[PDB]
Amino acid sequence: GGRLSVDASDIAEASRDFGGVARAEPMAVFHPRAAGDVAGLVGAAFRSARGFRVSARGHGHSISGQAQAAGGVVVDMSRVARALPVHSAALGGHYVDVWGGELWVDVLNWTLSHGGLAPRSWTDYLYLSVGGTLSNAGISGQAFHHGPQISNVYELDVVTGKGEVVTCSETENPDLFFGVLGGLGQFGIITRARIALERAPKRVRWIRALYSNFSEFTADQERLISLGRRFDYVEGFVVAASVLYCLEVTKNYDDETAGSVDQDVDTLLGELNFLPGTVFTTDLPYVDFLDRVHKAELKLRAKGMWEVPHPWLNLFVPASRIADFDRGVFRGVLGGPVLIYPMNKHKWDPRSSAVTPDEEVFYLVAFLRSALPGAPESLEALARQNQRILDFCAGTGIGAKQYLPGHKARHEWAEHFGAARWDRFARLKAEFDPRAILAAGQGIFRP
Numbered sequence: 001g002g003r004l005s006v007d008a009s010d011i012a013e014a015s016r017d018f019g020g021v022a023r024a025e026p027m028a029v030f031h032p033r034a035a036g037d038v039a040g041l042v043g044a045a046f047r048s049a050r051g052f053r054v055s056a057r058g059h060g061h062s063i064s065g066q067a068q069a070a071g072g073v074v075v076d077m078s079r080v081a082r083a084l085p086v087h088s089a090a091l092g093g094h095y096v097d098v099w100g101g102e103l104w105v106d107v108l109n110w111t112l113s114h115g116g117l118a119p120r121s122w123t124d125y126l127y128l129s130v131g132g133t134l135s136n137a138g139i140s141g142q143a144f145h146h147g148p149q150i151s152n153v154y155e156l157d158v159v160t161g162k163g164e165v166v167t168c169s170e171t172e173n174p175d176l177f178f179g180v181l182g183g184l185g186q187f188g189i190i191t192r193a194r195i196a197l198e199r200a201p202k203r204v205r206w207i208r209a210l211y212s213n214f215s216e217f218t219a220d221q222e223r224l225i226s227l228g229r230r231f232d233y234v235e236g237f238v239v240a241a242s243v244l245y246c247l248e249v250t251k252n253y254d255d256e257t258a259g260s261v262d263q264d265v266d267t268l269l270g271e272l273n274f275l276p277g278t279v280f281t282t283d284l285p286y287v288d289f290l291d292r293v294h295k296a297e298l299k300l301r302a303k304g305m306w307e308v309p310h311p312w313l314n315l316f317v318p319a320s321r322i323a324d325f326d327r328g329v330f331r332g333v334l335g336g337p338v339l340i341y342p343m344n345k346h347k348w349d350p351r352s353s354a355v356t357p358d359e360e361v362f363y364l365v366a367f368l369r370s371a372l373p374g375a376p377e378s379l380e381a382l383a384r385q386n387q388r389i390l391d392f393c394a395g396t397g398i399g400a401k402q403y404l405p406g407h408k409a410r411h412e413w414a415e416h417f418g419a420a421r422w423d424r425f426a427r428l429k430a431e432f433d434p435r436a437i438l439a440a441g442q443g444i445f446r447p
Ligand SMILES: *Cc1cc2c(cc1C)nc1c(=O)[nH]c(=O)nc-1n2C[C@H](O)[C@H](O)[C@H](O)COP(=O)(O)OP(=O)(O)OC[C@H]1O[C@@H](n2cnc3c(N)ncnc32)[C@H](O)[C@@H]1O
Pocket: 018, 055, 056, 057, 058, 059, 060, 061, 062, 063, 066, 067, 068, 077, 100, 101, 122, 123, 124, 125, 128, 129, 130, 131, 132, 133, 135, 136, 137, 138, 139, 140, 184, 185, 188, 189, 190, 191, 404, 439, 441, 442
């Protein structure tokens, strides 16, 4: 039922990503109609003499060619009938089956219009595929409480590196299920994901408060994630003044809780140590808050500042070493935001392929800088800054782990996973993709 394409615009899009650096071209782009089409293509790759590379492309948000299939075939997973949300008395909640290539923005609109339901755990940007984020983790301000998106999925349909369609969960083929979650596309292509849902809030009380003291800022973020009155979202960012820290929190509400929202916010804020008179508040619908990054994208696109190189660096930093990151990186080493917020490791299932630091509390530190348009030297200076951040972590023994890892050397991947996790990862590759057909742009395995 699928269609192979050699259209120059199809090839060009499959040969690029948001990073704007890696440009490995496929021989063709495959447009599937259903899961069986994806199975057919991977099956032919597995059966072929040379064993050509096959990679699924979500929305192309990768930084360094992770979705590229050099001289092979890129599967354009972008979008037919959609499954309606379902209630389960056994799970004690709702779920929705979605196509692997579905964008989170389209999942949200579908679930809201069919029962006022929504996923519990997000990414900051909704124009990302379900298969794409589930192959990494999928993190935002809710992860401290609900865990990442890989902790909010009941079941998958996976097309393995042998072109076999497998239904998997915790109780059915758990090795493939847990391997695929945070598995960097190594063990198969997600064609279906069964997403956990909750009754969606109607509105959001979105708060920002400033700190000049890093010790007070991190102490407040750490207390907020341990919280039963609590915020529904906890993030933060580094701002140039010398250096300031912005705490970002939200309180979700609906018609029932509308009458208590003001007091709940005031109570929680009173316990914090932000700078007096630096509180900024917005009240807006739930969809609008979740789509806030798409609004920033439209403004950047109009200024020609979206289709520029993005040498993004994402680190998971153990909370015991975050203090050293202030004078060492934010005041030391250093257009674009620097995100910072802690998460709880216990909300992350240790059976998944996801790699986190060996500490109960760890931070995402996200360097989201854009290079100047049409200026290669800008990208080069930013790449040197990223290497200086990595050298700082190595030289001071910070047990940081990259999120969306950009490694390409075997010993670097071995160090990233550690011996036990590397052994599990390699064994899953021998079982599920022995010819190393899938997601070869990640640069982990060779045929
Ligand atoms: C560009 C961007 C990315 C981003 C973000 C904001 C922007 C503007 N905000 C994020 C956030 O708040 N939290 C988070 O966890 N991630 C955030 N990101 C990063 C994003 O998650 C990643 O870029 C991720 O790769 C998803 O993006 P996308 O859906 O575009 O997928 P991809 O880049 O094409 O492919 C990524 C890898 O996964 C493999 N792949 C793709 N689809 C599948 C399926 N269906 N099954 C299995 N593997 C799949 C690709 O081959 C590639 O290896």
